[PDB]
Amino acid sequence: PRRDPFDAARGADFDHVYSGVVNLSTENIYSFNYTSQPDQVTAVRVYVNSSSENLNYPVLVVVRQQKEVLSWQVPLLFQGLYQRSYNYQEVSRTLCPSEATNETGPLQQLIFVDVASMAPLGAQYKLLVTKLKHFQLRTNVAFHFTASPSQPQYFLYKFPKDVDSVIIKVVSEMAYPCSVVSVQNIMCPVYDLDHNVEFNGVYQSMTKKAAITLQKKDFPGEQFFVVFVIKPEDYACGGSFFIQEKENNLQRKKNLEVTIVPSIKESVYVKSSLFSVFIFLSFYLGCLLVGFVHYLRFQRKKYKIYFWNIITIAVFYALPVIQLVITYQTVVNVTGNQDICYYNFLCAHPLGVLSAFNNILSNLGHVLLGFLFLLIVLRRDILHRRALEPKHFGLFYAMGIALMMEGVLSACYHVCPNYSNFQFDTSFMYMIAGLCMLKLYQTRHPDINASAYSAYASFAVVIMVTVLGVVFGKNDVWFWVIFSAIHVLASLALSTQIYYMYMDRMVLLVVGNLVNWSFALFGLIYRPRDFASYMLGIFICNLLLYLAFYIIMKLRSSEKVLPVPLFCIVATAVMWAAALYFFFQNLSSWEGTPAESREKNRECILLDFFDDHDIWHFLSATALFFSFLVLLTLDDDLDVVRRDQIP
Amino acid sequence: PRRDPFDAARGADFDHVYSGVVNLSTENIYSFNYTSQPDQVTAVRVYVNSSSENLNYPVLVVVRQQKEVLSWQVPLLFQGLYQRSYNYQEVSRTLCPSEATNETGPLQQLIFVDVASMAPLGAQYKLLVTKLKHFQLRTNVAFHFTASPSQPQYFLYKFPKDVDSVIIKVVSEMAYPCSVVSVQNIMCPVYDLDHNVEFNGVYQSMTKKAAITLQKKDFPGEQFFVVFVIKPEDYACGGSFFIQEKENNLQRKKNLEVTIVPSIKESVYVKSSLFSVFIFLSFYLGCLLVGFVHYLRFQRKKYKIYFWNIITIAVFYALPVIQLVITYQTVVNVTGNQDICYYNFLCAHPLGVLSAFNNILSNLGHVLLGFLFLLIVLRRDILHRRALEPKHFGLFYAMGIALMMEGVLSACYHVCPNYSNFQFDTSFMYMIAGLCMLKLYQTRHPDINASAYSAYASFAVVIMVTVLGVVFGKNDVWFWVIFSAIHVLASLALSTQIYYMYMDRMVLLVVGNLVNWSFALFGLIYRPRDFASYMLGIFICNLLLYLAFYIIMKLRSSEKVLPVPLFCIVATAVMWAAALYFFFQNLSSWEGTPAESREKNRECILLDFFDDHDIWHFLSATALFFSFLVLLTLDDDLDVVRRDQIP
Ligand SMILES: CCCCCCCCCCCCC/C=C\[C@@H](O)[C@H](CO)NC(=O)CCCCCCC
Ligand SMILES: CCCCCCCCCCCCC/C=C\[C@@H](O)[C@H](CO)NC(=O)CCCCCCC
Ligand SMILES: *[C@@H]1O[C@H](CO)[C@@H](O[C@@H]2O[C@H](CO)[C@@H](O)[C@H](O)[C@H]2NC(C)=O)[C@H](O)[C@H]1NC(C)=O
Ligand SMILES: *[C@@H]1O[C@H](CO)[C@@H](O[C@@H]2O[C@H](CO)[C@@H](O)[C@H](O)[C@H]2NC(C)=O)[C@H](O)[C@H]1NC(C)=O
Ligand SMILES: *[C@@H]1O[C@H](CO)[C@@H](O[C@@H]2O[C@H](CO)[C@@H](O)[C@H](O)[C@H]2NC(C)=O)[C@H](O)[C@H]1NC(C)=O
Ligand SMILES: *[C@@H]1O[C@H](CO)[C@@H](O[C@@H]2O[C@H](CO)[C@@H](O)[C@H](O)[C@H]2NC(C)=O)[C@H](O)[C@H]1NC(C)=O
Ligand SMILES: CC(C)CCC[C@@H](C)[C@H]1CC[C@H]2[C@@H]3CC=C4C[C@@H](O)CC[C@]4(C)[C@H]3CC[C@]12C
Ligand SMILES: CC(C)CCC[C@@H](C)[C@H]1CC[C@H]2[C@@H]3CC=C4C[C@@H](O)CC[C@]4(C)[C@H]3CC[C@]12C
Ligand SMILES: CC(C)CCC[C@@H](C)[C@H]1CC[C@H]2[C@@H]3CC=C4C[C@@H](O)CC[C@]4(C)[C@H]3CC[C@]12C
Ligand SMILES: CC(C)CCC[C@@H](C)[C@H]1CC[C@H]2[C@@H]3CC=C4C[C@@H](O)CC[C@]4(C)[C@H]3CC[C@]12C
Ligand SMILES: CC(C)CCC[C@@H](C)[C@H]1CC[C@H]2[C@@H]3CC=C4C[C@@H](O)CC[C@]4(C)[C@H]3CC[C@]12C
Ligand SMILES: CC(C)CCC[C@@H](C)[C@H]1CC[C@H]2[C@@H]3CC=C4C[C@@H](O)CC[C@]4(C)[C@H]3CC[C@]12C
Ligand SMILES: CC(C)CCC[C@@H](C)[C@H]1CC[C@H]2[C@@H]3CC=C4C[C@@H](O)CC[C@]4(C)[C@H]3CC[C@]12C
Ligand SMILES: CC(C)CCC[C@@H](C)[C@H]1CC[C@H]2[C@@H]3CC=C4C[C@@H](O)CC[C@]4(C)[C@H]3CC[C@]12C
Ligand SMILES: CC(C)CCC[C@@H](C)[C@H]1CC[C@H]2[C@@H]3CC=C4C[C@@H](O)CC[C@]4(C)[C@H]3CC[C@]12C
Ligand SMILES: CC(C)CCC[C@@H](C)[C@H]1CC[C@H]2[C@@H]3CC=C4C[C@@H](O)CC[C@]4(C)[C@H]3CC[C@]12C
Ligand SMILES: CC(C)CCC[C@@H](C)[C@H]1CC[C@H]2[C@@H]3CC=C4C[C@@H](O)CC[C@]4(C)[C@H]3CC[C@]12C
Ligand SMILES: CC(C)CCC[C@@H](C)[C@H]1CC[C@H]2[C@@H]3CC=C4C[C@@H](O)CC[C@]4(C)[C@H]3CC[C@]12C
Ligand SMILES: CC(C)CCC[C@@H](C)[C@H]1CC[C@H]2[C@@H]3CC=C4C[C@@H](O)CC[C@]4(C)[C@H]3CC[C@]12C
Ligand SMILES: CCCCCCCC/C=C\CCCCCCCC(=O)O
Ligand SMILES: CCCCCCCC/C=C\CCCCCCCC(=O)O
Ligand SMILES: *[C@@H]1O[C@H](CO)[C@@H](O)[C@H](O)[C@H]1NC(C)=O
Ligand SMILES: *[C@@H]1O[C@H](CO)[C@@H](O)[C@H](O)[C@H]1NC(C)=O
Ligand SMILES: *[C@@H]1O[C@H](CO)[C@@H](O)[C@H](O)[C@H]1NC(C)=O
Ligand SMILES: *[C@@H]1O[C@H](CO)[C@@H](O)[C@H](O)[C@H]1NC(C)=O
Ligand SMILES: [Ca+2]
Ligand SMILES: [Ca+2]
Ligand SMILES: [Zn+2]
Ligand SMILES: [Zn+2]
């Protein structure tokens, strides 16, 4: 079979459109010839059109280079998820470039394009082969382009000498189509197809936003390829089947803008760590100063088992979650799949094997303030015991331990947030609250009744409300039924609690009922994603309302308050308002697909290191500490009445 | 460029070897022609050989059919993991068949094969195109074949009219190379390459064994393709640098044998469920019978808060694990990746959305026997309270709840076992043991000391030993250090405990030390994969061994025993022996890669439903129940001594 390609290989030119017709007894060969100079990269792009009547007899296209062969067919055919098919009549591909070194010198390159078909009568085609002027990407310079499910794109980036780490930020002005962004190494071939893109590099599915962080040391040669591949359907990105438009002539054209920006330096790490440590060591320093001043001026002129049980429970609850999150982080590091953790990729600063270092360093406040509260409670206990030789000190010990464990579990959860972890930190608080309530009720004894046995009934209702939330997830009318059930339960539980402990009585009862109804309407506005956290927030705010009612009844001239109580309460109110502002900024969400969560990402504001969530962590820790301080030292004037005052 | 393929397309013959030389000015074209008859499937296979000097100028091969174009190059190039390359001189592929049905009638088919190269002098090649006689697979008939990294294979299976579910079992005699087995649907194209095989169907990585279960209703047309693809390196399958035989020219040939077998029916499900329920309801029936007999013959002629605390802890520990395993199962069902859960794939029988129904139904014994034990203890407590108007009843309630929770947590773990789940069920037991020991020590009071505070020191040593095991995993001499440490700790802890409670005393001390040293030797022989479970087993065996000294001392004519105690001890001894036998048959392991774990899979022996692990579950539950019964009813004869006997 002696065939000479050069006999019919037409010497073709770049940037020229060739029309043709091919059938069984015909085949078309085009020969393209060019030269590559040193220290310069040239990419070639091939475009083929064919009309859609060629369904049973497509047009087969083959591209031959010195070491590679590529091939496809027009129109491209895609298989849907629900037995549906799509066809695209325009196909474009970029051929893998070969860099030229000064030692090698300029090289001559030859390319062959073969177009064939098996149509009995004839198939029409149009061909166009061009060079790419915009192939190499520059730092800090935004680049716009367009992609299609049959026309994938990819570009080249070279690391600058000084830069040690970069971030690729990709933004589109509209979702649907949804795509995949991949980063791969230089060596050919380049996997830019739907069925092999998620094989080599690191990739992220995206609809409106995407961000990837890279380090120089992981790329030999200090260069990489960025590949953009569109998908035929939006099922994987939270959408439905094909959204046909007026122009859809099948095409899903997505307009994209890409930027590559250098990352921060380690001085930012040092400054952020020092600030975070000092802002909370200031509390210890101030407490020591106040104690020293009081000693200089004013002085001159049983529960152990209830502590060790909680310690044991905390340790043996914390260990497995630590192991699980370690496994998650290792898997994410190894595989390169970045759709596992729901980070805030715009301000996820890594350190070592850690992906988001800031989100873990932000939890220092919980631990430090819990330890300081434990120290204060221990001081009070020691002083009381020495004076005797103040009854619920075990409750305050449990409070401090719960604060510290909240910090620890939040740090564990933020290693890799997904939809299989929030439950641990949500449920530890339920366990601690149940233990504390049971111990308090037993310590109070029945005596009269006591009260009306509402506490364990409410806790049980909480238990199967959590069970029901586990069973049915956003299931028809069950959602509204359980929502109304829990709201009414909280309402009448607060009602009976305030009644069992006189116009102020029913005035405050009506106020509390109105506040609970306001909570109900707020929940009606925005549906609650998770039931356990919703109930926990309602429970905490109900306790705050009860504390407010208690202090308002104490402030009716029956008793007095020291400077420390009202200083603590005003600090608590201010800090709670400040924290509640930041609580409503959600930069990610495990409720939806990773792309939808990525749509909400935001840059960070404080010293270029901390986003809204870190500030929320800080403020919540401070507010909880001050609220606990209010709770502990509220009854101090009653010490004036001697002979075994209120405990 | 008008070119006629038929001018040089030599009419070629099947099963004939064609040799040739091609270069820049020469291209070889072969035309193959055949016919497909109705109700018959034919597949075509293409083979290309090329020598090794064609490194910079390979041979490019293109295959053209009516609706598909395929292409590759010889020698095939593969990229390693640490910057290495491999080249293969022989390539072969199977073309996607098109089945002809009676309404369409026989179809004439034409195929073109084009061979080209850009060598400046000349490149040699050899080509052979054949039909496949053995393409369709039959039921219960083994089939042998051979595969290579550059010669993937795949076959077709059609569901019989009556079989509703099948199992594909693949077996090879030697690992290294390690391969991938995939199941996909009928519609072309077929992904049989390293970079796209894990995209559409369901797949498993294998070295010696593989097993996949399929249901008919998931496949339109009731047929599928089974694809076998070998890998260039063994890194993903627990392997090191690829092994090269003395003979090998590079080629990693793998001999495989594949069988397809129908699955079991629902009658087995019904029979197994009935047997599992009744074998444990027999205990309730016998207890009721003995109570009725005792009533007919012999009669004719404070802790509440502890129970509720334990219940709260159990519930709020159990829930998040349930959510986590639900998420795991949903993910493994959706993504089709069967390397996530470490099942025993040879006897994993699905039901609904459950992948291994037997491994969960085998846990009924724990729950049922725990309920029976709790009922017995409650009866004893009620009778004692009625007689008064019997001290550690809270401890026995704790044991019953612990049996409940062991059953529940093991059932949760077996939903999808991997290297993230054993920690929960391991740690709950440590938490329960610590709480119970603390309660016992506090209630018994120091009085004298009490003892030497050995228990708290031992538990602390357990604490940071578990922490260290979390930190260092098989890290050089540290492994041996911690091993010797906890064996020594157990030895002297047991020595102190027995000494604090007389040649018999020294005899028993020597016996206990020798037993602990035997444990140390056994641990030296086989390394402990997990530290926490090793410590738990050591503690359990030491506990029943301490019970052994207790009874042997009690039978020194000072006191007697009733029929129930010695029946219980003989029962627990024999059932512990049987359970310990079944405990050493490991059919899966998360220590290694999924393929290495699959190497240990085994069929199931009991009623075609239950493997060895299920028998272990049953026997362990029964043995634990009888040991608890031994503990509860050991001191009954001393009730003869009235006036406030021992509590
Ligand atoms: C019975 C005696 C006291 C028991 C003490 C233990 C239980 C009280 C909570 C202890 C501190 C845990 C912190 C609570 C909540 C927040 O961290 C989280 C947000 O991550 N949940 C949320 O839901 C957000 C917070 C909701 C805010 C409500 C409005 C102020
Ligand atoms: C201290 C007062 C009583 C406390 C009661 C609660 C704590 C004791 C443990 C209760 C039983 C839990 C189950 C134990 C073991 C097995 O399930 C597992 C293997 O699945 N571990 C294993 O290690 C296997 C079993 C090892 C057996 C060794 C030889 C008998
Ligand atoms: C479609 O195929 C037919 C034959 O199957 C082609 O007809 C002849 O093609 C040769 C090839 O160069 C010409 O030399 C003859 O002149 C053609 N015959 C006639 C009567 O025109 C036909 O050319 C093919 N279609 C196209 C567009 O090339
Ligand atoms: C293939 O079809 C596309 C779409 O019909 C053609 O793209 C058009 O190109 C012209 C430039 O000559 C533009 O003015 C039009 O706006 C384009 N149409 C669009 C963007 O929808 C393309 O020229 C055709 N030919 C090739 C070789 O691609
Ligand atoms: C290798 O290429 C050279 C030129 O590029 C071929 O030399 C001529 O090839 C044509 C077509 O095959 C023949 O008609 C001439 O007779 C060849 N010239 C000579 C001097 O032999 C050469 O044939 C190619 N190699 C092979 C094996 O065909
Ligand atoms: C390609 O090379 C292989 C290996 O050299 C050839 O396979 C040999 O085939 C013959 C029969 O023709 C056997 O007797 C040998 O044992 C085979 N060698 C092996 C398996 O290593 C093959 O024939 C060559 N040609 C083609 C077209 O594949
Ligand atoms: C190799 C490059 C990244 C070095 C840059 C130095 C950075 C990574 C170092 C310098 C100061 C360090 C911090 C100093 C103090 C603390 C508080 C301590 O309780 C936890 C560790 C932590 C938070 C350190 C983390 C690592 C740190 C931020
Ligand atoms: C025995 C009882 C009454 C002791 C009560 C605890 C005392 C020592 C605690 C409770 C509230 C504390 C204050 C709370 C907040 C601040 C603001 C901070 O920027 C400096 C420290 C300072 C000023 C703390 C000093 C110590 C403090 C006064
Ligand atoms: C009570 C106080 C002392 C508790 C302090 C807990 C701190 C030190 C623990 C809790 C959770 C831990 C993290 C859990 C998981 C991982 C992932 C692993 O790949 C690197 C270490 C890292 C990031 C751990 C670092 C240490 C860590 C932050
Ligand atoms: C040594 C290897 C084989 C251990 C296997 C563990 C890996 C493969 C498992 C363990 C935990 C798993 C993840 C658990 C939860 C999620 C979140 C979900 O939205 C997508 C699936 C995903 C991301 C799972 C993917 C597979 C996974 C990462
Ligand atoms: C005592 C406590 C721990 C018992 C908790 C039982 C809960 C977790 C169990 C009992 C019944 C279970 C359900 C039974 C059936 C189905 C239908 C299936 O398509 C999805 C899972 C789902 C919805 C199960 C989810 C888990 C479930 C709700
Ligand atoms: C959405 C789920 C998953 C988590 C968040 C749920 C909890 C923490 C949320 C949901 C409803 C919220 C409350 C709704 C309304 C009010 C009244 C307003 O004057 C102060 C804030 C307050 C009191 C909110 C506090 C936080 C809250 C209790
Ligand atoms: C302890 C509590 C009751 C103290 C007072 C809390 C007040 C000051 C808090 C609670 C609810 C908060 C608001 C909740 C929601 C929003 C909408 C947002 O787009 C801007 C901030 C804004 C408007 C917050 C401002 C501060 C706010 C009004
Ligand atoms: C549609 C096909 C699969 C129907 C076949 C019937 C099978 C699946 C049915 C028939 C009898 C059933 C069992 C009957 C009793 C029990 C004990 C109970 O404590 C849990 C459910 C369990 C274990 C059932 C599981 C499902 C079961 C085995
Ligand atoms: C108050 C004290 C003495 C109560 C003692 C519990 C008695 C009633 C229990 C403890 C051990 C029990 C036995 C344990 C196991 C079996 C084997 C079974 O195939 C028949 C019932 C039988 C033989 C049980 C009968 C009831 C039994 C004897
Ligand atoms: C104290 C007794 C009553 C507790 C009984 C617990 C049993 C009924 C619970 C505990 C764990 C549960 C399983 C946990 C996870 C899943 C996966 C989900 O996709 C289907 C339900 C299934 C398979 C649950 C079935 C019911 C289950 C086995
Ligand atoms: C109070 C208890 C819960 C604290 C337990 C601390 C444990 C979980 C922490 C403390 C120090 C941590 C280690 C610190 C550094 C490294 C090196 C890194 O390459 C792998 C993770 C590893 C090995 C961490 C694993 C988690 C770790 C061991
Ligand atoms: C291997 C890890 C992961 C889990 C298993 C650890 C525990 C359960 C194993 C390891 C060592 C084992 C012991 C080794 C030696 C003896 C003495 C022999 O006469 C009876 C079995 C007995 C008493 C074994 C019981 C089970 C045991 C304690
Ligand atoms: C409570 C205990 C001390 C009762 C006596 C336990 C005896 C009978 C048990 C403990 C360890 C067991 C052995 C463990 C492992 C093996 C190796 C296996 O290939 C054959 C069975 C054999 C040899 C078992 C036989 C039974 C065995 C010897
Ligand atoms: C409750 C959380 C409190 C957080 C305290 C500070 C957290 C410090 C965490 C670990 C820092 C070092 C480990 C990070 C990766 C180790 C790799 C390396 O450092 O080289
Ligand atoms: C401690 C565990 C004891 C196990 C008791 C029996 C387990 C029964 C588990 C659930 C059975 C029904 C759920 C299985 C899949 C439901 C889907 C379906 O049946 O259609
Ligand atoms: C490609 O162009 C160069 C420049 O003139 C020429 O020397 C070379 O022969 C051309 N290649 C072919 C195959 O014609
Ligand atoms: C290659 O050599 C030329 C000759 O001066 C030089 O300009 C160029 O920088 C060299 N390439 C590199 C990468 O240094
Ligand atoms: C293939 O063989 C059949 C049988 O003789 C013949 O009719 C047909 O023309 C052949 N195909 C071609 C392209 O000649
Ligand atoms: C098609 O028709 C033939 C004619 O007898 C028959 O044998 C064959 O079974 C039919 N095909 C099917 C799928 O039934
Ligand atoms: Ca590449
Ligand atoms: Ca397919
Ligand atoms: Zn958080
Ligand atoms: Zn098990």
Author numbering:
A (entry chain B), B (entry chain A): 35 to 282, 286 to 338, 440 to 527, 539 to 650, 685 to 830
Give the text the authors published on this PDB structure:
The mammalian integral membrane proteins SIDT1 and SIDT2 are classified into a superfamily of putative metal-dependent hydrolases called CREST (alkaline ceramidase, PAQR receptor, Per1, SID-1, and TMEM8), in which alkaline ceramidase 3 and adiponectin receptors were reported to possess intrinsic ceramidase activity. Further investigations on two human homologs hSIDT1 and hSIDT2 uncovered their critical roles in RNA binding, absorption, and transport.
Despite of similar domain organization, the structures of hSIDT1pH7.5 and hSIDT1pH5.5 assume distinct conformations. Significant changes occur in the TMD of each protomer, particularly in TM5 and TM6, which lead to an open form for hSIDT1pH7.5 and a closed form for hSIDT1pH5.5, triggering rearrangement at the dimer interface (Supplementary Discussion S3). The hSIDT1 protomer harbors a putative Zn2+-binding site within the TMD close to the extracellular surface and a large internal cavity. The Zn2+ is coordinated by residues His563TM4, His798TM11, His800TM11 and a water molecule stabilized by residue Ser559TM4. The binding of this cholesterol molecule is asymmetric, with the head hydroxyl group forming a hydrogen bond with Tyr568 from protomer B, the ring structure making contacts with Tyr466, Val469, and Ile478 from both protomers, and the hydrocarbon tail stabilized by Tyr480 and Pro777 from protomer A. Given the presence of cholesteryl hemisuccinate (CHS) in the buffer during membrane solubilization and the analogous core structure shared by CHS and cholesterol, this density can also be fitted by CHS. Additionally, the cholesterol density near the extracellular juxta-membrane in hSIDT1pH7.5 is absent in hSIDT1pH5.5, suggesting that cholesterol has already departed from this site at low pH. Interestingly, another cholesterol molecule, which binds close to the central cavity and interacts with SPL in hSIDT1pH7.5, undergoes a noticeable outward and downward movement.
